[PDB]
Subunit: 250 residues, 3 copies
């Protein structure tokens, strides 16, 4: 009866608290209903499970099940090699993926998420992309869409969208190799942009002052796309028809 | 005397260490001066307090006080439902909000912060916005300004600024639905921008090469805003006054 | 024999588990081969070391060695004042710096990293910049380059690059006070940009529609950079040479 300290079912296995189970070699189970099943597995807290080697489950109802799993917080389940699940009810099912926040699931490989999702009975906002990171609330990435970075809320990415970045609240991305600043309804302005580098090859973002003034433009190409009349040949009568100009002008 | 294991004041309550207090049902208090007051509350470390149900306080002088609070690290106080405070002296006072770093306070709802702030005797850099996330050092968001994302240092947002994103060090935002890349003193250039989609409705970011060359421009609208003379009617004498042109030209 | 509870070598020092060492005042060592050497140092888990005052080492093979160090997870070594190392094999060697993820090292001051790196026998992706934050996989920042923010993967910053931000996968930055959206090989488009503010001083990002239409341009400056002929003086014969125009036109 009462809390007690005793050896588990394996060598160097420690059970501390009430109704604790330690089965792995060099494992430790501290708290109430804490299970340490694999070798060098530490499970500290209340109702925590450590079913993987070298796995750590700290907090409340945390689950670790792979070779290096860290489940710190409340109701987090880190099921992935070298994966970390931190916060409240964060599920990581990928490889070398991390997740910090509340009610977020990351099933992608080498992926990550930092924000708040939603969990009624299932995860409605999940990260299924590889090498993809999300920072925001209620953001979704479809499976097969990789190398996507989200900085915003209520951002959803469809299938087959690679190398895309979405910035701002309610951002929407619909193509690959693009950076989205907003949706079709709300469009954000880019303020305090540096001076451009107008040239034939330079690829910068021009400013309103440059377009207002037109410094550095091609004075020859622009004079052909729009048919303009330079002041010199007007003053000098160059490129003038003479057979019918003499008719109207007598 | 000495460290001892014993039952607390409730059923299935475990006190481990020296001067430990466990009052909640199914609670555990491990370490020195560790207090577990609510049901299924785990407080591990030195001088940690767990005053909320299902709350976990791990580390040094960590405080948890709500239904799902995670206070991991040093001097962190997570006071919020489903809120997580990780790092050194991080205070979370919002709902479903997370905070990782040092000396940062997040009072917003569904908000977050990842960086370094300042705490002399009070938090001088705090997040008071809803659905707002900060990544950087010494960043401030005023109350009432929501859906704001900061990626930079020394960035301050005033009141009534929504849907704004600030990028880069020393960035400044002064309007809603805008993305700031810098301040009035330093302006950053946007480099390696993709080719534009010049049209009547398309809203992209043009490049220096496009403005240099002018491909895809409206050859009719641009020829009216600037009064230009096309080469065809000059060659053909169209739209010519005849009553007074005959005077100067004889 | 077996797990036991006993006092350490200092006042209020608690050793729990098998082969645990507690030498600091008010320290606690819980688990297997857990060492708490400094005052108020807590080391919970398997093979964890707490060699700094007020330091917390939780998890598996975690090391804390400064005045406020948090090493939570697997194989994390937080060597820095007010520094936090969370995840799997994260090393923090800076001051007030945090690191969350797997196989990432942060040697910068007030710096941070959130992502996945690489550790064969040494850290190949490290953050050596001050006040710099990285979010992505396999990203590198050279020493001396400060105030740099990275949101992407496979992004490397050379020496002497300050106030630079890189967005997107495979982004490349080569200058200071610039924002990079891509590399010389892949260039990303900026989509859904708000309407510009064309003026003499305003510095915004223009859209394709504005350049297509040319609203708000300088009708006087643009008519001098490109020599154009306004329709009024053509209709009115102003600025016309008369001594030699009478020759070709008779």
């Amino acid at each position: 009866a009462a809390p007690v300290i005793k050896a588990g079912t394996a060598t160097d296995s420690t059970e501390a608290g009430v109704d604790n189970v330690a089965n792995g070699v060099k494992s430790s189970a501290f708290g109430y209903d804490n299970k340490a099943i694999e070798k060098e597995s530490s499970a500290f807290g209340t109702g925590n499970r450590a079913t993987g080697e070298f796995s750590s489950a700290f907090g409340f109802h945390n689950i670790a099940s792979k070779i290096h799993s860290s489940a710190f917080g409340s109701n987090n389940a880190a099921d992935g090699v070298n994966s970390s699940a931190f916060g409240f009810k964060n599920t990581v099912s990928g490889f070398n993926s991390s997740a910090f926040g509340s009610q977020y699931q990351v099933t992608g490989n080498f992926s990550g998420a930092f924000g708040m999702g939603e969990f009624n009975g299932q995860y409605q906002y999940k990260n299924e992309g590889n090498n993809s990171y999300m920072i925001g609330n209620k953001n979704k990435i479809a499976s097969g869409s990789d190398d996507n970075f989200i900085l915003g809320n209520n951002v959803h990415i469809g299938g087959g969208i690679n190398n895309s970045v979405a910035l701002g609240n309610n951002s929407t991305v619909s193509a690959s190799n693009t950076v989205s600043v907003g949706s079709s309804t709300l469009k954000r302005k880019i303020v305090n942009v540096g001076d451009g580098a107008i040239s034939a090859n330079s690829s910068d973002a021009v400013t309103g002052r440059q377009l207002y003034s037109g410094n550095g433009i091609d004075t020859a190409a622009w004079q052909n796309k729009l048919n303009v009349t330079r002041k010199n040949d007007y003053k000098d009568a160059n490129d003038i028809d003479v057979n019918k100009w003499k008719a109207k002008l007598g």
